[PDB]
Amino acid sequence: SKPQPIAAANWKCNGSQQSLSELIDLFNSTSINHDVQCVVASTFVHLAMTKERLSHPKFVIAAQNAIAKSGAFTGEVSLPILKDFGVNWIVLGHSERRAYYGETNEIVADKVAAAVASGFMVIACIGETLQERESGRTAVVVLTQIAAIAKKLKKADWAKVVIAYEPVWAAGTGKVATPQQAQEAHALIRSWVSSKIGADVAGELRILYGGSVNGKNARTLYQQRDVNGFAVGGASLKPEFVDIIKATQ
Amino acid sequence: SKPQPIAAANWKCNGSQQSLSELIDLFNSTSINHDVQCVVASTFVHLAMTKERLSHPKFVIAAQNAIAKSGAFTGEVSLPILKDFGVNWIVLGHSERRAYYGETNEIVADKVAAAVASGFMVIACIGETLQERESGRTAVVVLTQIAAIAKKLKKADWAKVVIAYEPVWAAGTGKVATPQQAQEAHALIRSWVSSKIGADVAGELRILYGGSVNGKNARTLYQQRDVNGFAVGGASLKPEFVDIIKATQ
Ligand SMILES: [K+]
Ligand SMILES: [K+]
């Protein structure tokens, strides 16, 4: 059967003290009857508030980015700073950082390896753009992305690693990913891990769908063989995120 | 007479909850007699603990970076989020962000303009590299940087703008600029502001020096005609910062 599902809330660069606290109150009051690891990834600024307010046993807190080491890097946040601050989860290599902030396949790989070495649970993000998919390069792109990450990891490190597939080709492009299209991408990633890392690792690896979801389509998406949860964007700032949690059973 | 001096502490990407707490406790117990605006720019993560424990009346809290608007920008922090969090000061266009994180002259200018429009006090960083100075291109490089900023500002905006002249070759290298080198650069900057923006604006404009400032060289640096304070990196993580504050007369 599937490993423990994950419902990750990527709040991105959003939220006020009031709006986020209200949403945290809803999460705290939400009863969850099945084994699922829920994750709340707030901005660095809201990490303190989230730590103090979030109390649900099946919820942990994550950062949306970091650099490997502390030092002369004005504006950035390092892994030791997050570790000292009690944050043990992190989202790395998000498509927006790959696009906007110069994070190459190797830069993402270095951050992930650094985070794992520091003891973090890591949600590593991969996925192809519309240009790459339409040019028939979905497979080569996503496999190159995860190959770069694996190059800096050992087999034992994958116990701390989570893979999130972002259908970037469907992000504000007008396109819509079908459950079949998502499954095909997940199965492809699964197949690579099995042959390159191990069938044991592949069986335990959580592959999260990182595309647009609501309560309804998330239930359908979780029916797919190689979908192990969701890395949610916009819907994670809404009460709808509760439905997405329930979508993982 | 000089305008109100500024002692800015740029902790950069450093510090634990404990180490920064000790710095703050020292700052709180430090008697500051003269008129000076002290600034502490911690990481996004430590903003909350700084707001809570820092209570010295002549100290304000700053961010080390931001982007203009909230939205789908994973890992980043926006100006509206900082404003909601009660943070009203910010350092922008630091040499480390110009070099590592793709912040061009025009990118810096847009952030500065956005910050001023949102009601922030802005410490805008400019400065030349080692090669640019030794090739005798300090003037054209530094003045081009502030010109790009100036293009995006109305005259009224300069009241919220603080200029930090920070030569890259002096950043953390232990090679502080001589009082003459700093004065020469500050005089050049204020002269350009006087001619292009107005003599009234230039008379009120604060020009800080940044680059290996410590408790031993600060006093002599501030004695110069056009030096209105300091942007401090490494020494701002030490008790030495108190001596730099007092060095502003
Ligand atoms: K969504
Ligand atoms: K968003």
Curated annotation (Swiss-Prot), chains A, B:
Its EC number is 5.3.1.1. Substrate binds at N10, K12. Coiled coil: none annotated. It is an enzyme of class 5 (isomerase). It holds the Pfam family TIM. Keywords: Gluconeogenesis, Glycolysis, Glycosome, Isomerase, Peroxisome. One of its GO terms (biological process) is glycolytic process. It is found in: Glycosome. It catalyses: D-glyceraldehyde 3-phosphate = dihydroxyacetone phosphate. Its main location: other. One of its GO terms (molecular function) is triose-phosphate isomerase activity. The active site is at H94 (electrophile), E166 (proton acceptor). Pathway: Carbohydrate biosynthesis; gluconeogenesis; Carbohydrate degradation; glycolysis; D-glyceraldehyde 3-phosphate from glycerone phosphate: step 1/1. InterPro entries: Aldolase_TIM (IPR013785), TIM_sf (IPR035990), TrioseP_Isoase_bac/euk (IPR022896), Triosephosphate_isomerase (IPR000652), Triosephosphate_isomerase_AS (IPR020861). GO terms for cellular component: cytoplasm; cytosol; glycosome. Homodimer. Belongs to the triosephosphate isomerase family. The enzyme contains a high proportion of positively-charged residues in beta-barrels V and VII (compared to the homologous regions in other triose isomerase sequences). Since 2 clusters of positive charges located at precise distances on the molecular surface are common to 4 glycosomal enzymes, it has been speculated that this might represent a signal for entry into glycosomes. This is Triosephosphate isomerase, glycosomal.
